[PDB]
Amino acid sequence: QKRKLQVGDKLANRHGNKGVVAKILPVEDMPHLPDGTPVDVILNPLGV
């Protein structure tokens, strides 16, 4: 089977920050740069 990312999957970086995916948003809902480029991931600053 071919598995795509879904709500409940676990992600991490190399510095020990981990968490499960809780929400998937359509592209027009994401924050974007003034040139129209949207971001991919939103991380909480309260974990730092």
């Binding site: 795509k4 359509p26 592209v27 027009e28 974007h32 003034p34 129209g36």
Partner: protein, 224 residues
């Protein structure tokens, strides 16, 4: 405030700038944002939906004489841009027959009436001598993003469904500048920037988005 002037600047069939000025204070965001939301989500286009390759049973296999596997080949077919010249056309099937050694591009598809390929130089596969590729690609017309699990379209037994990304719009941004008219000084100047794939022009996409918003405004008419 007097009716604004509309200006259009276009670069080919893929980029365009649309300017509306002067506007009242705050109306640039009021008009710009809803158009951007509609443009990025509700504009119809075309996408590859199902592929059949001769002597291939599923997508987790390889083909003798071909450098790429079926998964990589399908990833290349999701970048194909097909333009229907007839508004009544809903589905077409493109045929390809090749023998190595050669690099097969999107221009190797057989010609079809009222169908145009917008990126003929798109690489598809690399054939070594002794390799063959005989495939049929089905292109549908639709709106939005539809995973292969939802439609499950197969024209024959061994066909492989493909995830469809129908939207022809690539990127949208809008600018708000500070203009003035005589004594009034806090007026807005609005510019819309639209990027498309070429099957639909930015001016065509803008007109279709304005009609979608106008249609929705009639829903506030009859209170039940």
């Amino acid at each position: 405030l007097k009716a604004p002037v509309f200006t259009v600047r276009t670069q080919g069939r893929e980029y365009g700038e649309f300017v509306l000025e002067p506007l009242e204070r705050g109306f640039g965001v009021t008009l710009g944002n809803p158009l951007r939301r509609i443009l990025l989500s509700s504009i119809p286009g075309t996408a590859v939906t199902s592929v059949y390759i001769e002597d291939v049973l599923h997508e987790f296999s390889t083909i003798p004489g071909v450098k790429e596997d079926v998964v990589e080949i399908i990833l290349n077919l999701k970048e194909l841009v097909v333009r229907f010249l007839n508004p009544s056309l809903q589905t077409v099937t493109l045929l390809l027959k090749a023998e190595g050694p050669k690099e097969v591009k999107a221009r190797d598809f057989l010609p079809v009436a009222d169908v145009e390929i917008m990126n003929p130089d798109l690489h598809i596969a690399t054939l070594e001598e002794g390799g063959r590729l005989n495939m049929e690609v089905r292109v549908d017309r639709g709106v939005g993003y539809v995973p292969a699990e939802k439609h499950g379209i197969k024209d024959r037994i061994n066909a492989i469904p493909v995830d469809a990304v129908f939207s022809p719009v690539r990127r949208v941004a809008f600018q708000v500048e500070d203009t003035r008219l005589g004594q009034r000084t806090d007026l807005d100047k609005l510019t819309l920037r639209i990027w498309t794939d070429g099957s639909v022009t930015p001016l065509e996409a803008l007109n279709q988005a304005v009609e979608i918003l106008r249609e929705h405004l009639t829903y506030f008419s009859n209170p039940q």
